Short mmCIF file of C-alpha atoms and ligand atoms in Angstrom, two decimals:
data_model
loop_
_atom_site.label_atom_id
_atom_site.label_comp_id
_atom_site.label_asym_id
_atom_site.label_seq_id
_atom_site.Cartn_x
_atom_site.Cartn_y
_atom_site.Cartn_z
CA UNK P 1 -81.56 185.98 -14.91
CA UNK P 2 -80.11 182.80 -16.33
CA UNK P 3 -80.38 181.43 -19.82
CA UNK P 4 -80.23 183.05 -23.24
CA UNK P 5 -81.54 186.29 -24.67
CA UNK P 6 -82.99 187.79 -27.83
CA UNK P 7 -82.10 191.49 -27.88
CA UNK P 8 -82.35 194.27 -30.43
CA UNK P 9 -79.24 196.15 -31.44
CA UNK P 10 -81.46 199.08 -32.37
CA UNK P 11 -80.82 202.31 -34.22
CA UNK P 12 -77.12 203.35 -34.25
CA UNK P 13 -78.33 206.94 -33.90
CA UNK P 14 -79.18 206.18 -30.27
CA UNK P 15 -75.44 206.55 -29.63
CA UNK P 16 -75.97 210.30 -30.04
CA UNK P 17 -79.35 210.49 -28.28
CA UNK P 18 -80.39 210.86 -24.67
CA UNK P 19 -83.97 209.60 -24.52
CA UNK P 20 -84.03 206.21 -26.25
CA UNK P 21 -85.38 203.60 -23.84
CA UNK P 22 -83.69 200.68 -25.62
CA UNK P 23 -80.28 202.24 -24.92
CA UNK P 24 -81.19 202.70 -21.24
CA UNK P 25 -82.21 199.05 -21.06
CA UNK P 26 -78.92 197.94 -22.62
CA UNK P 27 -76.85 200.23 -20.38
CA UNK P 28 -78.53 198.64 -17.37
CA UNK P 29 -77.68 195.12 -18.54
CA UNK P 30 -75.16 194.32 -15.80
CA UNK P 31 -77.37 195.69 -13.04
CA UNK P 32 -80.78 194.37 -14.09
CA UNK P 33 -80.30 191.44 -16.47
CA UNK P 34 -77.04 189.48 -16.03
CA UNK P 35 -75.18 190.18 -12.76
CA UNK P 36 -72.47 187.55 -13.17
CA UNK P 37 -69.59 188.25 -15.53
CA UNK P 38 -69.75 185.71 -18.40
CA UNK P 39 -66.69 183.78 -19.50
CA UNK P 40 -67.52 184.64 -23.11
CA UNK P 41 -70.39 185.81 -25.28
CA UNK P 42 -71.88 184.28 -28.42
CA UNK P 43 -73.78 186.86 -30.50
CA UNK P 44 -76.05 185.50 -33.21
CA UNK P 45 -76.00 188.40 -35.66
CA UNK P 46 -78.83 189.49 -37.92
CA UNK P 47 -76.20 191.31 -40.00
CA UNK P 48 -74.02 188.30 -40.85
CA UNK P 49 -75.93 186.40 -43.52
CA UNK P 50 -74.48 183.16 -44.85
CA UNK P 51 -75.52 179.89 -46.45
CA UNK P 52 -74.27 177.65 -43.64
CA UNK P 53 -73.68 178.54 -39.96
CA UNK P 54 -70.41 180.44 -39.73
CA UNK P 55 -68.45 181.56 -36.71
CA UNK P 56 -65.56 184.02 -36.45
CA UNK P 57 -62.22 182.90 -35.02
CA UNK P 58 -59.99 185.87 -34.18
CA UNK P 59 -57.84 187.00 -31.28
CA UNK P 60 -58.81 190.69 -31.54
CA UNK P 61 -62.19 191.89 -32.81
CA UNK P 62 -62.21 194.56 -35.43
CA UNK P 63 -65.16 196.94 -35.22
CA UNK P 64 -67.09 196.69 -38.50
CA UNK P 65 -69.12 199.84 -39.15
CA UNK P 66 -71.51 198.11 -41.52
CA UNK P 67 -74.16 200.79 -41.75
CA UNK P 68 -74.91 203.54 -44.26
CA UNK P 69 -75.18 207.30 -44.02
CA UNK P 70 -74.88 207.84 -40.30
CA UNK P 71 -73.09 210.81 -38.70
CA UNK P 72 -69.28 210.67 -38.65
CA UNK P 73 -68.93 209.90 -34.90
CA UNK P 74 -70.64 206.56 -35.47
CA UNK P 75 -67.73 205.50 -37.68
CA UNK P 76 -65.09 206.35 -35.07
CA UNK P 77 -66.41 204.03 -32.35
CA UNK P 78 -64.05 201.18 -31.54
CA UNK P 79 -65.21 198.26 -29.39
CA UNK P 80 -61.89 196.60 -28.64
CA UNK P 81 -63.09 193.30 -27.35
CA UNK P 82 -60.97 190.14 -27.43
CA UNK P 83 -62.16 187.45 -29.77
CA UNK P 84 -63.26 184.05 -28.48
CA UNK P 85 -61.46 181.50 -30.65
CA UNK P 86 -62.03 178.59 -28.26
CA UNK P 87 -65.74 179.39 -28.11
CA UNK P 88 -65.75 179.46 -31.92
CA UNK P 89 -64.12 176.03 -32.17
CA UNK P 90 -66.54 174.68 -29.59
CA UNK P 91 -69.51 176.00 -31.57
CA UNK P 92 -68.14 174.34 -34.70
CA UNK P 93 -67.74 171.01 -32.92
CA UNK P 94 -71.18 171.18 -31.30
CA UNK P 95 -72.86 171.91 -34.62
CA UNK P 96 -71.02 169.13 -36.45
CA UNK P 97 -71.69 166.67 -33.63
CA UNK P 98 -75.38 167.39 -34.23
CA UNK P 99 -75.17 166.79 -37.96
CA UNK P 100 -75.12 170.43 -39.01
CA UNK P 101 -72.36 172.09 -40.98
CA UNK P 102 -70.40 175.04 -39.60
CA UNK P 103 -67.66 177.08 -41.21
CA UNK P 104 -65.00 179.23 -39.58
CA UNK P 105 -63.98 182.74 -40.64
CA UNK P 106 -60.51 183.61 -39.32
CA UNK P 107 -60.62 187.31 -40.34
CA UNK P 108 -64.05 188.84 -39.67
CA UNK P 109 -64.48 191.13 -36.66
CA UNK P 110 -67.79 192.16 -35.10
CA UNK P 111 -70.54 193.79 -37.10
CA UNK P 112 -72.69 196.37 -35.37
CA UNK P 113 -75.33 193.77 -34.42
CA UNK P 114 -72.72 192.67 -31.89
CA UNK P 115 -70.54 195.59 -30.86
CA UNK P 116 -73.25 198.26 -30.77
CA UNK P 117 -75.41 196.73 -27.99
CA UNK P 118 -72.33 195.20 -26.33
CA UNK P 119 -70.67 198.59 -25.94
CA UNK P 120 -73.63 199.57 -23.72
CA UNK P 121 -73.99 196.20 -21.96
CA UNK P 122 -70.26 195.58 -21.44
CA UNK P 123 -68.56 198.93 -22.09
CA UNK P 124 -65.20 197.71 -20.77
CA UNK P 125 -64.82 195.43 -23.81
CA UNK P 126 -63.10 192.77 -21.68
CA UNK P 127 -65.42 189.82 -22.46
CA UNK P 128 -64.34 187.51 -25.31
CA UNK P 129 -66.88 187.80 -28.14
CA UNK P 130 -67.67 185.35 -30.92
CA UNK P 131 -70.29 185.99 -33.60
CA UNK P 132 -72.48 183.38 -35.30
CA UNK P 133 -74.20 184.04 -38.62
CA UNK P 134 -77.82 183.46 -39.59
CA UNK P 135 -78.94 181.70 -42.78
CA UNK P 136 -81.90 183.75 -44.01
CA UNK P 137 -82.79 181.39 -46.87
CA UNK P 138 -83.39 178.64 -44.28
CA UNK P 139 -86.40 178.39 -42.01
CA UNK P 140 -87.12 179.00 -38.35
CA UNK P 141 -86.70 175.31 -37.57
CA UNK P 142 -83.15 175.32 -38.97
CA UNK P 143 -82.20 178.18 -36.68
CA UNK P 144 -83.89 176.55 -33.69
CA UNK P 145 -81.83 173.39 -34.33
CA UNK P 146 -78.61 175.45 -34.55
CA UNK P 147 -79.43 176.78 -31.08
CA UNK P 148 -80.38 173.37 -29.70
CA UNK P 149 -76.92 172.09 -30.66
CA UNK P 150 -75.41 174.96 -28.68
CA UNK P 151 -77.25 174.55 -25.38
CA UNK P 152 -74.34 172.67 -23.68
CA UNK P 153 -72.49 175.99 -23.76
CA UNK P 154 -74.77 177.26 -20.95
CA UNK P 155 -73.07 175.09 -18.34
CA UNK P 156 -69.69 176.49 -19.51
CA UNK P 157 -70.39 180.12 -18.58
CA UNK P 158 -71.27 181.27 -22.09
CA UNK P 159 -73.76 184.11 -22.53
CA UNK P 160 -75.72 183.41 -25.73
CA UNK P 161 -77.46 186.40 -27.28
CA UNK P 162 -79.40 186.68 -30.52
CA UNK P 163 -79.20 190.24 -31.86
CA UNK P 164 -81.96 191.18 -34.28
CA UNK P 165 -85.02 193.40 -34.56
CA UNK P 166 -88.34 192.08 -33.33
CA UNK P 167 -90.36 194.03 -35.89
CA UNK P 168 -88.10 194.96 -38.79
CA UNK P 169 -90.01 196.00 -41.91
CA UNK P 170 -88.72 197.18 -45.25
CA UNK P 171 -87.63 200.80 -45.51
CA UNK P 172 -90.57 201.21 -47.93
CA UNK P 173 -93.20 200.36 -45.34
CA UNK P 174 -94.98 203.61 -44.36
CA UNK P 175 -94.58 204.97 -40.85
CA UNK P 176 -97.10 205.57 -38.07
CA UNK P 177 -95.13 208.39 -36.43
CA UNK P 178 -95.16 208.38 -32.63
CA UNK P 179 -97.68 205.54 -32.60
CA UNK P 180 -97.47 201.85 -33.47
CA UNK P 181 -98.88 200.50 -36.71
CA UNK P 182 -101.64 197.98 -35.89
CA UNK P 183 -100.07 195.27 -38.08
CA UNK P 184 -96.95 195.58 -35.93
CA UNK P 185 -98.90 195.30 -32.68
CA UNK P 186 -100.55 192.18 -34.09
CA UNK P 187 -97.26 190.48 -34.96
CA UNK P 188 -95.54 191.56 -31.77
CA UNK P 189 -98.45 190.34 -29.65
CA UNK P 190 -98.67 187.02 -31.47
CA UNK P 191 -94.98 186.41 -30.88
CA UNK P 192 -95.20 187.40 -27.22
CA UNK P 193 -98.21 185.13 -26.69
CA UNK P 194 -96.59 182.19 -28.47
CA UNK P 195 -93.39 182.49 -26.42
CA UNK P 196 -95.05 183.10 -23.04
CA UNK P 197 -97.39 180.19 -23.83
CA UNK P 198 -94.49 177.87 -24.56
CA UNK P 199 -95.77 177.32 -28.12
CA UNK P 200 -92.23 177.19 -29.47
CA UNK P 201 -93.13 175.02 -32.43
CA UNK P 202 -95.53 177.78 -33.49
CA UNK P 203 -92.63 180.23 -33.23
CA UNK P 204 -90.60 178.02 -35.54
CA UNK P 205 -93.59 177.91 -37.92
CA UNK P 206 -94.37 181.62 -37.75
CA UNK P 207 -94.68 181.80 -41.55
CA UNK P 208 -97.78 179.61 -41.35
CA UNK P 209 -99.29 181.17 -38.24
CA UNK P 210 -98.18 184.69 -37.40
CA UNK P 211 -100.20 187.69 -38.63
CA UNK P 212 -98.31 190.14 -40.82
CA UNK P 213 -94.94 188.41 -40.73
CA UNK P 214 -94.60 189.44 -44.39
CA UNK P 215 -94.65 193.08 -43.28
CA UNK P 216 -92.65 192.59 -40.08
CA UNK P 217 -89.87 190.44 -41.57
CA UNK P 218 -89.77 190.50 -45.37
CA UNK P 219 -86.27 189.01 -45.15
CA UNK P 220 -86.45 187.31 -41.70
CA UNK P 221 -82.74 187.78 -40.94
CA UNK P 222 -83.60 190.10 -38.03
CA UNK P 223 -86.00 187.52 -36.57
CA UNK P 224 -83.92 184.34 -36.89
CA UNK P 225 -81.48 185.19 -34.04
CA UNK P 226 -84.48 184.66 -31.76
CA UNK P 227 -84.88 181.06 -32.92
CA UNK P 228 -81.20 180.34 -32.26
CA UNK P 229 -81.23 181.89 -28.80
CA UNK P 230 -84.50 180.09 -28.04
CA UNK P 231 -83.07 176.75 -29.15
CA UNK P 232 -79.93 177.33 -27.09
CA UNK P 233 -82.03 177.37 -23.90
CA UNK P 234 -82.68 173.63 -24.18
CA UNK P 235 -85.93 171.75 -23.89
CA UNK P 236 -88.98 173.52 -22.45
CA UNK P 237 -87.46 176.88 -21.51
CA UNK P 238 -89.55 179.55 -19.82
CA UNK P 239 -89.72 182.86 -21.70
CA UNK P 240 -90.17 186.33 -20.26
CA UNK P 241 -90.41 189.77 -21.81
CA UNK P 242 -87.71 191.97 -20.27
CA UNK P 243 -87.94 195.12 -22.42
CA UNK P 244 -90.41 196.60 -24.87
CA UNK P 245 -90.26 199.82 -26.85
CA UNK P 246 -90.91 201.15 -30.33
CA UNK P 247 -89.07 203.46 -32.66
CA UNK P 248 -90.61 206.89 -33.20
CA UNK P 249 -91.49 205.80 -36.75
CA UNK P 250 -94.01 203.42 -35.24
CA UNK P 251 -93.05 200.37 -37.31
CA UNK P 252 -89.78 199.11 -35.76
CA UNK P 253 -90.21 197.31 -32.45
CA UNK P 254 -87.76 196.12 -29.85
CA UNK P 255 -89.51 193.46 -27.78
CA UNK P 256 -86.68 191.72 -25.87
CA UNK P 257 -86.79 188.20 -24.44
CA UNK P 258 -85.05 186.06 -21.85
CA UNK P 259 -85.24 182.27 -22.25
CA UNK P 260 -84.67 180.57 -18.90
CA UNK P 261 -83.83 176.84 -19.08
CA UNK P 262 -85.75 174.35 -17.00
CA UNK P 263 -83.64 171.38 -18.16
CA UNK P 264 -79.93 170.61 -18.49
CA UNK P 265 -77.49 168.51 -20.48
CA UNK P 266 -75.50 165.49 -19.38
CA UNK P 267 -72.50 165.65 -17.05
FE1 FE2 B 301 -80.11 195.63 -37.80
#
């Protein structure tokens, strides 16, 4: 495939498990999704929440274990990827050239939205990684425009990946164990239909249109990486669903999308 992706980083517990389909999908990334080695990777992280777009600019990525109450082994994982400082500067220029602000963090490593799926996709940790934050108090259209500014990166060998959670309710939302709560089916299906239809404006305006977005994304920070990845695919991309699974609690969903460009930018 070519283009950009919206993936789910999933449950860190899957590191210890054998039968999680999302992990199998991620492990097969280089065989089934992206054959060609990318020059660098831009991860739009649901777990880096800022006021204005921010990008990290480091030579070596720390591994940030920003998650609570997991088993000890999870905190010993190191994903020793190189940073991507030139990619970071290029993201800052592209955003500013489009009239958007962008700040640069020269210390922050990768949070688990980045390193956790990447350690399955690219276990050799030899691809330069740069993370981009989301701005959860801004709307879907903001995030789409951040991505649109970034689409020239596609012709430069950059793999752009939004890392979120397609259905990501509050911890207080009751479970439907080993099933799928109908509200979550409804939201997931609406989103799939909007994307496969090419109704990308609807996706940007999900708050006005999507059923049960209040349950699926009370904060939205796990959805907004989709808008950035979608915008980064340029005008009129074609979307396809490349993985779907659900957590055993029946209310977290991992629908995964590829956005294939049909247009390009100037020489
Ligand atoms: Fe998450």
